[PDB]
């Protein structure tokens, strides 16, 4: 085509293309190598990606995200019923299937999860087309290893709706291993552990690979643990700080909390490469500017329990795979949250100093491997 590889993520999506023996992770119109898996509807337009996430603060009920948590599921699934209580948008039942309901151009409309995801895939397809200067049709799309047949089918359908010919649906941890060339034949079997901490989910997968064939030996994790929870801890910290300094509580002002969360998420990224970050928000609440800062040490303390807790699923995955830590040949970091130094320290310490595969931006590793596989299948 070339054919492309797309990581359709819970919170960010990423597209890559393999050419001249190299994977190019493609930047979008705003120069971002990943794009929010968000879609929004207004009185006059449909927004996707950066454009949609940039207005979530002002249009919460018609800005959809987390479609991946509904895709391929039944409305009566316990997971769906539980998640619905936390989303600002409406989810309705259409003959046993969930649909997100929103207002668009003044009329009520509803979309199946695969239609919402097809919008995100359309954006990734267009991002690749702008870079290649050619039409893109063929693609490999990834999914969590635990997705069942229905979830895989609905994900493939999202691609087809977007005009893609989905060559294959492959597992995220497998795509990550392929990115590092761990699929090459070296003789004996090899055990690889994928530690994937994204914006909303934490996945530990142990793969055994031999003759280029992958076997998922075990999986563990938490579908409700991710970078967004670390942002939440920072938000609560700063709401308390603003209350102490101005004797005002901003908790019930949705736009204030949103601007604070956005600044916290950005400060967090800075803390993965610097030991302090500044937060400067003009007129945060009632015209009061909020200029402050946070140290990496404080950020780690605010999240100490959540960070240390990522090791339990690692131990559980090892136990279920009937493997001792010493039998893991490679550890691969995936997910933007694995860029956090304290998480890398915890994991490396747990593995007694074993080095981590982390040269490929973790938030891009899944798309990177998908792109490689798409070229192979093409």
Ligand X SMILES: Nc1ncnc2c1ncn2[C@@H]1O[C@H](COP(=O)(O)OP(=O)(O)O)[C@@H](O)[C@H]1O
Q: What are the residue numbers of the active site?
A: 7, 68, 172, 196
CA angle 72, 75, 77 (to 5 degrees): 80
* Residue 190: CB minimum distance to Cl ion, A: 28
d(C-alpha 264, C-alpha 339), whole Å: 16
Helix (H, G, I), strand (E, B) or coil at 342: helix
- Residue 99 interacts with which of ligand X, K ion, Mg ion, none, CB < 5 to 8 Å by class: none
Closest residue to ligand X, based on beta-carbon distance: 227
CB of 345 to Cl ion, least distance (A): 5
**Residue among 92 and 130 whose Cβ is closer to Cl ion:** 130
Residues 189-248 binding K ion (CB under 5 A) are: 196, 198, 201, 203
Residue 32 vs 253, nearer CB to Mg ion? 32
Contact status: 310 vs Cl ion (CB under 5 A): no
Residue 19 near residue 207 (C-beta atoms within 8 A): no
Comparison of 40 and 343: residue with beta carbon closer to ligand X: 343
Among 192-200, 208-216, 284-292, 319-327, the segment contacting Mg ion (CB under 5 A)? 192-200
24-43 positions binding Cl ion, by CB under 5 A: 28-29
Is the CB of 259 or the CB of 339 nearer to ligand X? 339
- According to DSSP, residue 63 is labeled E
Instruction: Count Cα atoms within 13 angstroms, Cβ side, for 367.
Output: 29
Binding to ligand X (CB under 6 A) within 191-230 occurs at 198-200, 226-228
Whole-number Cα distances in Å, 265 to 235, 254, 302: 9, 16, 14
CB 366 to Mg ion: min, Å:
6
- Residues 3-22, one symbol each (x = binds Mg ion by CB under 5 A, - = not), give ------x-------------
By a kind-dependent CB cut-off of 5 to 8 A, residue 336 interacts, out of Mg ion, ligand X, K ion, none, with ligand X
Residue 336 in contact with ligand X, rule: CB under 6 A: yes
Rounded (5°) CA angle 93-109-154: 55
Tokens for 274, please give them: 């610097």
How many angstroms separate the CA atoms of 306 and 300, rounded? 10
Residue 15 near residue 4 (C-beta atoms within 8 A): yes
Q: Name the binder of 268 from ligand X, K ion, Mg ion, none, CB < 5-8 A by kind.
A: ligand X
As measured in angstroms, the least distance from the Cβ of 23 to ligand X is 16
Structure tokens at 338: 């694995």
Rounded least distance, CB 6 to Cl ion, Å? 14
- End-to-end Cα distance, the chain: 8
Please say whether the beta carbons of 263 and 247 come within 8 A.
no
Q: How many CB atoms lie within 10 A of CB 202?
A: 24
Contacts (CB under 6 A) with ligand X, residues 249-288: 265, 268-269, 272
- Selected from 363, 365, 367, 374, the binder of ligand X by CB under 6 A is 363
Q: Which does 12 bind (CB under 5 to 8 A by kind): K ion, Mg ion, Cl ion, none?
A: K ion
If contact means CB under 5 to 8 A according to the sort of partner, which of Mg ion, Cl ion, K ion, none does residue 362 touch? none
Instruction: Using alpha carbons, select from 33, 8, 334 the residue that is nearest to residue 139.
Output: 8
CA dist., res. 20 & res. 284, Å (int): 49
| Sign of CA pseudo-dihedral 97, 102, 104, 109 | positive
CA proximity to 346, closest of 319, 317, 318, 306: 306
Residue whose C-alpha is closest to residue 190's, from 7, 314, 329: 329
198 near Mg ion (CB under 5 A): yes
Closest chain position to Mg ion (CB): 198
Q: Which residues bind Cl ion (CB under 5 A)?
A: 28-29
Q: Which residues bind ligand X (CB under 6 A)?
A: 9-12, 34, 198-200, 226-228, 265, 268-269, 272, 335-337, 339-340, 363
Q: Which residues bind Mg ion (CB under 5 A)?
A: 9, 198
């Amino acid at each position: 085509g070339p054919a492309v590889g797309i990581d359709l993520g819970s919170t960010y999506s990423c597209v890559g293309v393999f050419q001249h023996g190299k994977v190019e992770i493609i930047a979008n119109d705003q120069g971002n190598r990943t794009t929010p898996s968000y879609v929004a509807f207004t009185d006059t337009e449909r927004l996707i990606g950066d454009a949609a996430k940039n207005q979530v603060a002002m249009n919460p009920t018609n800005t959809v995200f987390d479609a991946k948590r509904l895709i391929g599921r039944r409305f009566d699934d316990a997971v769906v019923q539980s998640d619905m209580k936390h989303w600002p948008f409406m989810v309705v039942n259409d003959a046993g299937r969930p649909k997100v309901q929103v207002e668009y151009k003044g009329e009520t409309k509803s979309f199946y999860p695969e239609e919402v995801s097809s919008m995100v895939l359309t954006k990734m397809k267009e991002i690749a087309e702008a870079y290649l200067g050619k039409t893109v049709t063929n693609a490999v799309v990834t999914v969590p290893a635990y997705f069942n047949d229905s979830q895989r089918q609905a994900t493939k359908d999202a691609g087809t709706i977007a005009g893609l010919n989905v060559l294959r649906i492959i597992n995220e941890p497998t795509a990550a291993a392929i990115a590092y060339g761990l699929d090459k034949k070296v003789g004996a079997e090899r055990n690889v552990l994928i530690f994937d901490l994204g914006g909303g989910t934490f996945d530990v997968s142990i793969l055994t690979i031999e003759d280029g064939i992958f076997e998922v030996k075990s999986t563990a994790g938490d579908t409700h643990l991710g970078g967004e929870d670390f942002d939440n801890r920072m938000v609560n910290h700063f709401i308390a700080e603003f209350k102490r300094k101005h004797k005002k509580d901003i908790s019930e002002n949705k736009r204030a909390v949103r601007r604070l969360r956005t600044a916290c998420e950005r400060a967090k990224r800075t803390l993965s490469s610097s030991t302090q970050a500044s937060i400067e928000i003009d007129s945060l609440y009632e015209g009061i500017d909020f200029y402050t800062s946070i140290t990496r040490a404080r950020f780690e303390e605010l999240n100490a329990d959540l960070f240390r807790g990522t090791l339990d699923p690692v131990e559980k995955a090892l136990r279920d795979a009937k493997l001792d830590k010493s039998q893991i040949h490679d550890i691969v970091l995936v997910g933007g949250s694995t860029r956090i130094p304290k998480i890398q320290k915890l994991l490396q310490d747990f593995f007694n100093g074993k080095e981590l595969n982390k040269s490929i931006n973790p938030d891009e590793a899944v798309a990177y491997g998908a792109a490689v596989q798409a070229a192979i299948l093409s």
